[PDB]
Each structure stands twice: as C-alpha cells, then as structure tokens.
Amino acid sequence: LKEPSAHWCRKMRTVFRPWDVEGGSKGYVTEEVFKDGVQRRLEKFPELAPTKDKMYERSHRHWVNHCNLGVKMPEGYRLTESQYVQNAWLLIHSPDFEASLKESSQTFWEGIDREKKGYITKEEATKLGIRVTKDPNLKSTGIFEAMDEKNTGRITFEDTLKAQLFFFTDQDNTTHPFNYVRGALVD
C-alpha cells in the first residue's frame, strides 16, 4: 500500500479517541474495553435495548474484525492508537469494507427507525447526531445541509452511509462537512 494522508490519520485518531477514553485514557484499548462498553452503550442509546442480546457479539466482532483485521489476538492484547490507525489503513483497502460499515450501521439504524421507513427527520438526525458524537456543536459543522442537499427535511440511511464512507476513506478534502460525521476532530 501507499501511505495515508496526515488528515486521514487524524480522522482515525478521532475514531479511536472515545474508545481510549472509555478504557481509562491509557493510550491503548483491549477486548475488555469493548465488552464493558456494551452496558455504557445501552445506557446512552436505549434504542439498542431491543437487540441487547446481540451486543456482546457485536463488541467481540468489532475487536476481532474491525480493530484487529480478523485476527484472534492473545488474551490481554493491547491495541495502541497508532496501531489502530495503521490497521484501519489496511481495513479500508479490503473489498468488503464498504459492506462492513453498512452492516454495522444497519444495527444502529434499526433501533432508531423501528417502522423501517429508511429515513428520519433532519431535526431528529441533529439530536441523534449530537448524542452519537458527543459534539454539542454538530449542527454548525454543516453536515445536515450537506447530507440533505435538496432540503427535503429528511435524512436517509443512505445519506448517513455516504457521509460515513467519505469520512473513513477520503484522503485530501479537509473542508467538506462529511469530515465531521463523528464530531469535531481530535489533534
């Protein structure tokens, strides 16, 4: 492979940071951080409660498949921030990466869209996005305008997938609002 841009690495540090914080701000995360994070997620997103019995598997698959490239790592393995960034670099080159993001996103979307409409209102999306990202200033990023480019007042599942795929893969566009799909960037 080539090398990721500095901007893309910053985006990946932005993915990793909340997990690092969950694990005690040690600079690394473990399988246990994600297992413990199940309860935290059920409290923050009670929309996930109807599928709470699937959460431990989701955490474990996240550790093995997303964080560690499908490899079973030793008990106690400590994945560092910089390592996650390089593992994510390999991951986004996988032929099935886009599908993996969509499948994961479907698990969240089905909790917030119980009637299976395929969309939510822009105001609902704004409140939910603030909850997801913990960025109280998410609206000012422009992301809701950039997703709803025709001003329908709706945000579709596909809108959010498009923003997220840009975030996980784009190298050089540093100003587009889709940069902020996970909230304000860390250093």
Ligand X SMILES: C=C1[C@@H](O)[C@@H]2O[C@]3(CC[C@H](/C=C/[C@@H](C)[C@@H]4CC(C)=C[C@@]5(O[C@H](C[C@@](C)(O)C(=O)O)CC[C@H]5O)O4)O3)CC[C@H]2O[C@@H]1[C@@H](O)C[C@H](C)[C@H]1O[C@@]2(CCCCO2)CC[C@H]1C
Are 146 and 163 a contacting pair, CB within 8 Å?
yes
Are 79 and 67 a contacting pair, CB within 8 Å?
yes
Among the residue ranges 1-9, 72-80, 85-93, 123-131, the one whose residues contact ligand X (CB under 6 A) = 123-131
Nearest CB to ligand X, comparing residues 85 and 101? 101
Q: How many Cβ atoms are within 10 Å of 34's Cβ, its own excluded?
A: 23
Q: Does 91 bind ligand X (CB under 6 A)?
A: no
Q: Does 181 bind ligand X (CB under 6 A)?
A: yes
Q: Does 23 bind ligand X (CB under 6 A)?
A: no
Rounded CA gap, 118 and 97, in Å? 22
Q: From the list 10, 58, 78, 139, which residue makes contact with ligand X (rule: CB under 6 A)?
A: 58
Are 144 and 159 a contacting pair, CB within 8 Å?
no
* DSSP code for 46: G
Residues that bind ligand X in the complex, under the rule CB under 6 A: 34, 38, 41, 45, 55, 58-59, 62, 101, 104-105, 107-108, 125, 128-129, 132-133, 143, 160, 163-164, 181
